[PDB]
Design goal:
InterPro entries: Aldolase_TIM (IPR013785), GH (IPR017853), GHL15 (IPR029455), TAT_signal (IPR006311). It holds the Pfam family GHL15. It comes from Stieleria marina. By secondary structure, the chain is α/β, with parallel strands linked by helices. The chain is built from twelve helices and 15 strands. The protein has one domain (about 15-320): Aldolase class I (TIM Barrel, Alpha-Beta Barrel). About 35% of the residues lie in helices and about 20% in strands. The strands form three sheets. Strands 1, 2, 3, 6, 7, 8, 9, 10 and 11 form a nine-stranded mixed sheet that branches. Strands 12-13-14-15 form a four-stranded antiparallel sheet, with helices on one face. Helix 1 (about 25-35) packs across helix 3 (about 55-70) and helix 9 packs across helix 12.
Length: about 350
């Protein structure tokens, strides 16, 4: 409620989610972000080239953004499952081998690149992890935390590595770490998590709602979520969770993603042409289902340069409050706003936005 980012329907509601590893945002970049949104999550690595640690880079960025826009809610990225190297916290975790997660054989559980995965069932680890979040948001200038990697924690394949007993303890540990985060950071801070996910094999809607404020739909229209069935499931879950009072962040992709090699090799001007042509469909999907506290992100990745500071005239046009609920006819969706009429067909991937 009162701790949410200040929401408006005046124009398309926008959020940001990115990092600039090479330094703080320039004056122009910070002015752009702070003026055009009240809601940004700063990624791992942000400003580490000049500030050393992600914690120091994010803290300095939060201060400069809030000097520009005191209503900007700045969210600290803190992965719930993975021990990334570019945080001061990494060399703290390195000193607590009693916490480290192992497979049934006693081998350390690490992703490729010697990236340890956390044993959420360990209470001492959880106290430390939530302390890192509290340092960033209570003592520091951020307004909340972005808890990534829930689908990885829940993956049934982890049972093979850990055994069933440890798997269940880790799933309970996720419940406990979310609760303990809320207790340590307070009721006026935001908990954003990743997230809502719809694939043919595995799906997750908004969860942990007594504690979490916001969920990302990270894969909208892309990855294993491009089918009409999974798109409809994502849009309907946005509608449902936001009608129930939650924040939903729909991550649109600008016709390609950061793992699409041929697309990522194209000259920037061509990427921009693709991004312009690719906007209407996901924007219409977002507007079809959007409710209060729903935000759109649109780009091709999570580094600043991946389209994150591009802009489009659609984001400047009067939108206004919805004047009716989303209407569905099979794969076709429509929505009426005070200053716009939205139509999208998930089966043909056609869309129309009539601005007025």
């Amino acid at each position: 409620e009162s701790h949410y980012p200040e929401f408006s329907w005046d124009t398309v509601p926008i959020a940001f989610h990115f990092g600039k590893s090479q330094g703080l945002l320039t004056k122009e970049e910070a002015e752009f972000v702070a003026t055009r949104s009240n809601f940004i999550c700063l990624e791992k690595g942000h400003a580490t080239r000049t500030h050393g640690t992600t914690e120091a880079g994010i803290e300095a960025e939060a201060r400069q953004l809030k000097n520009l826009n005191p209503k900007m809610k700045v969210i600290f990225y803190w992965n719930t499952f993975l021990d990334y190297s570019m945080f001061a916290a990494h060399k703290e975790y390195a000193k607590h081998p009693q916490w480290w997660l192992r497979t049934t054989t006693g081998e350390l559980d690490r992703k490729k690149g010697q990236l340890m995965r956390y044993d959420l069932s360990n209470a001492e680890f959880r106290n430390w992890w939530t302390n890192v979040a509290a340092k960033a948001v209570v003592d520091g200038t951020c307004d909340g935390v972005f808890m990534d990697a829930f689908p990885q924690i829940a993956s049934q394949a982890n049972r093979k590595l850990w055994g069933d007993e440890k798997f269940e303890a880790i799933q309970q540990g996720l419940q406990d770490i979310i609760q303990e985060t809320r207790q340590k950071i307070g009721d006026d801070k935001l908990i954003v998590y990743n997230g809502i996910r719809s694939t043919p094999d595995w799906s997750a809607g908004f969860d942990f709602a007594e504690y979490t404020d916001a969920a990302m739909i990270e894969h909208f229209g892309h990855f294993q979520s491009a089918s009409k069935e999974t798109m409809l499931r994502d849009i309907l879950e946005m509608q449902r969770a936001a009608k129930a009072g939650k924040i939903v962040v729909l991550k649109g992709w600008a016709g390609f993603t950061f793992i699409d090699d041929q697309a990522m090799r194209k000259p920037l001007t061509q990427k921009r042409r693709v991004a312009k042509d690719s906007l209407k469909f996901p924007l219409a999907c977002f507007l079809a289902g959007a409710q209060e506290n729903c935000y759109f992100i649109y780009n091709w990745g999570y580094r600043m340069e991946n389209g994150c500071l591009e802009w489009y005239p659609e984001f400047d046009k009067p939108l206004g409050k919805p004047v009716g609920e989303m209407v569905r006819d099979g794969w076709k969706l429509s929505r009426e706003y005070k200053h716009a009429s939205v139509r999208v067909d998930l089966e043909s991937k056609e869309a129309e936005i009539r601005w007025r």
